[PDB]
Amino acid sequence: DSVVDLLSYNVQGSGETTYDHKNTFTLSCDGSLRHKFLDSNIKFSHVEKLGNNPVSKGLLIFDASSSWGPQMSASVHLDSKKKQHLFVKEVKIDGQFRVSSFYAKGTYGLSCQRDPNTGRLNGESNLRFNSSYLQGTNQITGRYEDGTLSLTSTSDLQSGIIKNTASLKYENYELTLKSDTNGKYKNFATSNKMDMTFSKQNALLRSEYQADYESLRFFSLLSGSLNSHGLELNADILGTDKINSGAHKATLRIGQDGISTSATTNLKCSLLVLENELNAELGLSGASMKLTTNGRFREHNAKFSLDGKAALTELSLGSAYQAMILGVDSKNIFNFK
């Protein structure tokens, strides 16, 4: 208490906390701060029925008011009760925020219904957010039924410029996930759809995606299946445009019989075409390698390929190439064992 305003204020708060031996509990926390630039109102009530009827009530009362524009407030309403034997819970949370003109509001709503006799639960979630330059909203539905879960997610991002949806299912001790995301920005028609699967031993990988930018339709395919007996993976990716087309495929098998790799790259550019084939098998009969490459431009042809076998009994590598480039006869052979 002083003649000067800024030197005068109020600061106080009661943090009451008491448990009733009756198996009932109550928590009270009051916050009130009085100052010449800001005015804070804080009050939170928390009470728990620790005897019978396991009810839980939680309420927050908060309001702070700066005397120089900014105004803030948030409310929390926690409601959980055992309706006879149906456990009913509902939560309402809302945080509201402005400064002078900037806006920021996020409202959330959660609903949960459970039947423990049947081991079944119904979870429903609502999310919405708004601001001066940002819009956010998402919904989640969770269905659990006595060991069986069915969860689904739908997300809208910045007014839906990007759309994402995730589907998950876990039944019979085997997991399956599906996940999709798609772009709606500028010239990008990007769309990725991802699914994952799981068995007692096997996990399966399928991944698709298309970029589809301007005139370029680029595609990537990945297929990965695994087991106790090594991996089998194929990566297949295509980049095709108005004229040019990047086409390469790679196949890799990890088997107890040995390793078989097959990476192939074919490129065509108007009057130029390129073809590339490597073929290596790392088996038990000596490593086998086979190569092929014939780059074709206009009429001119270059024809190359190489055979190769490396066995303990014998090593065989025979190289050959021929071409008529600029009409110049050209041929080389290298055979040696």
Resolution to 1 decimal, in Å?
9.0
Q: What angle do CA 42, 46, 47 make, to 5 degrees?
A: 150
Where helices occur in 185-240 by DSSP H, the ranges are none
Closest CA to 73 of 62, 82, 83, 84: 62
Please state, in angstroms and rounded to a whole number, the distance separating the CA atoms of residues 143 and 104.
Answer: 32
Please state, in angstroms and rounded to a whole number, the distance separating the CA atoms of residues 157 and 222.
Answer: 27
φ, ψ for residue 79, nearest 5 deg: -135, 110
Residue 132: C-alpha distances to residues 69, 104, 155, 223 (Å): 16, 7, 20, 44
Q: What angle do CA 140, 141, 146 make, to 5 degrees?
A: 140
Instruction: Specify the amino acid at residue 76.
Output: V
Let me know: does 90 contact 118? Beta carbons within 8 Å. Answer: no
Residues in the chain: 337
Quote the tokens at residue 273: 């075409």
Contacts of residue 122, Cβ cutoff 8 Å, sequence gap at least 6: 111, 112, 113, 114, 142, 143, 144
Let me know: does 175 contact 198? Beta carbons within 8 Å. Answer: yes
Question: Which residues are 299's β-sheet partners?
Answer: none
Closest CA to 98 of 124, 131, 127, 145: 131
Method in brief:
cryo-EM
